[PDB]
């Protein structure tokens, strides 16, 4: 039930909230301190995963390890390209509890 719920919340973040897709933009958003949630596919390189976890620990932001891969994370975002890392600027749908 967790996977379908997180997929539905991810869909509702799209079309209703501000997000960003990709690795470089995710790092850029984290180091500006305006990313509220970082979602990583398990297909992510381990070095990249560890570095993003360290960045989020520095920025005090939550990391969710998505139970798919970059293909299924791209599908969950409504896109036709693989996304391996994404950052949520603001949910607009109670994905991140206030």
């Amino acid at each position: 039930k967790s996977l379908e719920s997180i997929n539905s919340r991810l869909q509702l973040v799209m079309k209703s909230g501000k997000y960003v897709l990709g690795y470089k933009q995710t790092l850029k958003m984290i180091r500006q301190g305006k990313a509220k949630l970082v979602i990583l596919a398990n297909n992510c390189p381990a070095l990249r995963k560890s570095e993003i976890e360290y960045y989020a620990m520095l920025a005090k932001t939550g990391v969710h390890h998505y139970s798919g891969n970059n293909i299924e994370l791209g599908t969950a975002c409504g896109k036709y390209y693989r996304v391996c890392t994404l950052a949520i600027i603001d949910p607009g749908d109670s994905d991140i509890i206030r």
Partner: protein
Amino acid sequence: GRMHAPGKGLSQSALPYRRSVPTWLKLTSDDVKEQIYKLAKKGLTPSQIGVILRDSHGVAQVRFVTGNKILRILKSKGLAPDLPEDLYHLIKKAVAVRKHLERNRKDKDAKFRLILIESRIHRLARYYKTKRVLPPNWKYESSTASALVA
């Protein structure tokens, strides 16, 4: 009987003969409206909006109190979903069945159910293109439908 099942069930909803709003309902038309709006921002489809409005806020029929249906209100304010509720759910079911099938070759029963699901999807899509709800060139492709739902 059912469209794709040998069932002849009768479970329905008996709408009462009294179309008038109940006296004990203090909610006026516009109040029920912002209730719909806030619960549409939460992502609830019109069926769920009607269900929770009947269950919790005690309104019997949105149409009886406001004069318009739930989807009409959502469309008038322009926050109605791009795909229809039932077609969206049918596509979601088809995507789930295909995802289960790509791991299970020997599930021929799942293949049969998938054929039934896609048959209903195509018939509903033909109906919606007839009423110009959908674009005339709107087609359901099994490969690209995964990005449309969930």
